[PDB]
Amino acid sequence: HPFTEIKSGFLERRSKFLKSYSKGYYVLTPNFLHEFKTADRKKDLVPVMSLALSECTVTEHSRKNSDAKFVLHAKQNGIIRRGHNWVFKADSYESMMSWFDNLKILTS
Amino acid sequence: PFTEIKSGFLERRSKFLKSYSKGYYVLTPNFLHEFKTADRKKDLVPVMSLALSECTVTEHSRKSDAKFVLHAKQNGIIRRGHNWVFKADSYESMMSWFDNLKILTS
Amino acid sequence: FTEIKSGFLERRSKFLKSYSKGYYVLTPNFLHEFKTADRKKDLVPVMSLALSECTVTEHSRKNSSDAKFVLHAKQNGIIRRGHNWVFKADSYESMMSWFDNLKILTS
Amino acid sequence: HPFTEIKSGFLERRSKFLKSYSKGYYVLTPNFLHEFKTADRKKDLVPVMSLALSECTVTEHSRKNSDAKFVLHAKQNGIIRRGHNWVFKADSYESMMSWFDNLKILTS
Numbered sequence A, D: 001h002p003f004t005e006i007k008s009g010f011l012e013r014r015s016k017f018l019k020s021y022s023k024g025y026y027v028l029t030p031n032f033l034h035e036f037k038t039a040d041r042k043k044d045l046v047p048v049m050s051l052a053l054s055e056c057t058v059t060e061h062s063r064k065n066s067d068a069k070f071v072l073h074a075k076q077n078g079i080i081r082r083g084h085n086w087v088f089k090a091d092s093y094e095s096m097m098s099w100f101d102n103l104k105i106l107t108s
Numbered sequence B: 001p002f003t004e005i006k007s008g009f010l011e012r013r014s015k016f017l018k019s020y021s022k023g024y025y026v027l028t029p030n031f032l033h034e035f036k037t038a039d040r041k042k043d044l045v046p047v048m049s050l051a052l053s054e055c056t057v058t059e060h061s062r063k064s065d066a067k068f069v070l071h072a073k074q075n076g077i078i079r080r081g082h083n084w085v086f087k088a089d090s091y092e093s094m095m096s097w098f099d100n101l102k103i104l105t106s
Numbered sequence C: 001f002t003e004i005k006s007g008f009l010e011r012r013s014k015f016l017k018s019y020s021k022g023y024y025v026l027t028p029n030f031l032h033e034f035k036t037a038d039r040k041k042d043l044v045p046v047m048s049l050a051l052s053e054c055t056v057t058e059h060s061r062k063n064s065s066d067a068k069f070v071l072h073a074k075q076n077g078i079i080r081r082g083h084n085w086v087f088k089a090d091s092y093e094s095m096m097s098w099f100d101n102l103k104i105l106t107s
């Protein structure tokens, strides 16, 4: 089961409506940030959602001392309404910055 | 910064309805994605994404002579063991889809 | 081919005070130079400049050549640490496309 | 120092002329298989060579039970002469197959 993954791992996404974080298993490719319900990379291969990097940017992130959050901004209507913003939370500042920087270089 | 192998329109047959429906498909190293349209800037959410690691391509038309079969090895979008039939515009176009899919799903 | 931008740029030599032209391909990781734009037959970069080791500092203001920008080396690679290479595009508008992408990539 | 890495790790490349293996640190992106002298991802960033995937294929590999080798074939003149073949050796069959399958899906 090869896969052109640039980064993978669990992230929590804040829901503005549910007022809580939903954890998923995320996989970054050159085209999409995909969410899967689980990390079973051999069997769980229908994405919950696929966010097109061509129309997303990463804007802000936590300053080191949770300090492990970043914002993904939508430039066009898709999974996210144009102009709207999703907040992600990683395990640590360092992990967050790995996600942030990898996303940044694919969304310039 | 895209990474796509092939893109274009395909018709997918319904086994039960015995009819074809058309979509815009994008083949990447990981998925066969279907979109409603070819507008990569405004049509951003795949109708479905078929994981290649769970599929094989089995047969195709000989020189419509533009069909090929995608077989599901595991449950996903397609039930395990089932088969979806796609139709391109020409034999030559179909063979481009097939030859890439064959390598990707080996 | 996963690329952000491609096109011809002229690179100035500090000491020779002249420009030389190449075909550049900007990816998330590198600014690559090739001799030509033939991506099927010209396969080996003349040089590959790692973006994580660079920053872009200044660029020309619009004339209203206004098409230059500066790439600064933060570490020793193709360019010695602390040194600067100057590139020239065909227009201010083209230059700003290069600069704006580079600014984001090298932040 | 973010980087669009699909896979990275040490490989040994056989030299037909030196009659020996040369070890390098390899990084696979969607565009190239790069070799670096070392794994210092923060400082060693001039590739020793960059092999364009658009004109390479992977042809054969070892059968399990060294059984950790694969062949990279050149379709065009570049680092390798058109029609010529380079042999790589990984640490294990499993590692080799990870390299082989990741290369295969980027070179169809």
Ligand SMILES: O=P(O)(O)O[C@H]1[C@H](O)[C@@H](O)[C@H](O)[C@H](O)[C@@H]1O
Pocket: A014, A015, A019, A020, A021, A066, A069, A087
């Ligand atoms: O959206 P909810 O209600 O889940 O709020 C939380 C946050 O979004 C965090 O920044 C934060 O670190 C918190 O733990 C806080 O609970």
Ligand SMILES: O=P(O)(O)O[C@H]1[C@H](O)[C@@H](O)[C@H](O)[C@H](O)[C@@H]1O
Pocket: D014, D015, D019, D020, D021, D066, D069
């Ligand atoms: O071409 P050289 O001389 O480098 O020979 C080697 C091999 O090609 C390997 O299969 C093998 O596992 C060996 O290590 C052997 O040295």
Ligand SMILES: O=P(O)(O)O[C@H]1[C@H](O)[C@@H](O)[C@H](O)[C@H](O)[C@@H]1O
Pocket: D003, D004, D005, D008, D025, D027, D036, D037, D038, D039, D040, D041, D042, D043, D044, D045, D046
């Ligand atoms: O430039 P060097 O030789 O240091 O190569 C490294 C990389 O540039 C990384 O993407 C990567 O994740 C590596 O760790 C790899 O060592």
